[PDB]
From a paper:
Constructs off7_H09_3G124 (crystallized at pH 4.6) and off7_H12_3G124 (crystallized at pH 5.0) diffracted to 1.9 Å and 2.4 Å resolution, respectively. In these structures the ligands were lost from the complex at acidic crystallization conditions. [name] repeats carry a conserved TPLH motif in the first helix of the N-cap5, 23, and protonation of the histidine residues in this motif reduces stability and weakens the binding affinity of the [name] moiety, leading to the loss of MBP and GFP from the ternary complex.
Residue numbers in the entry: 12 to 327
The structure:
Amino acid sequence: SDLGKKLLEAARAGQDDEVRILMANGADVNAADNTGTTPLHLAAYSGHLEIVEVLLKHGADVDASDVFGYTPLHLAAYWGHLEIVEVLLKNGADVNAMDSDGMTPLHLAAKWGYLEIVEVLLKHGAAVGAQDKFGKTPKDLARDNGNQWIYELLEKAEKDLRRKLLEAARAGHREEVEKLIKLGADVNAADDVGVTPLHLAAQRGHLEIVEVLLKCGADVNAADLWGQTPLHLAATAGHLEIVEVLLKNGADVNARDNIGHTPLHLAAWAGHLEIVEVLLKHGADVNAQDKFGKTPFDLAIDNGNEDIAEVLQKAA
């Protein structure tokens, strides 16, 4: 198309008048190059804020991707055009769009050292844990490119993300956790005392958070400072369903904490009968005795939970 190429060339050169005249004469605002480049791509690439706004007003696709997968936001970040980045976000640009190599706008900003653009992409929900085709994150690219201010900025964002996923698990919000998962969250990340989101989820009974994390790759046998597998914390609080899911995904029945207790101990200590039945079905060792020399039968009789001691002897 004749008018199309002229519009592309006008947006790149920064000729607002020609841009307006060509569109006034029927030039498609979303004209496509042979590589998929649109005039918005070239205006955002060149740093022409006025043209960018003009094109968007006339219906420019804010999320157009060329053959390599770059969007106007990729290009604005690639060249460090803060004002354009903001305008593209105001107009509904996908902050977490990925090009062919897995790079997102945050990757590019972190790679080229555009601190102010990093800050803005975060404020608008940029995925901090995204990994490109080469398994590198924006923080990895800041480190490899010697952008230390951005490195510290992104490291603190990962930490803040780590605490939110702990609260959202301790609170019980699936979709609120799921948005953090899609934001690049490390489900296997723990706090200072080795407590993961799967721990706090299995302990408080905010179910279904348990299933997603295990399907995401959360280590079922993650042990905290006290050697507690999430299966331990679920046995005490008395949440049946969670017990099956963990054992359903390779959890260990004979997992021993620092004290030497297994989920069968903690279920016989508390007084949750229906728990021990499930454990016994999975070869839960009734002979296992902790460092106190006590067996799950000893704790069943110490706390006087007779119904438990009875069934423990039938299976012993």
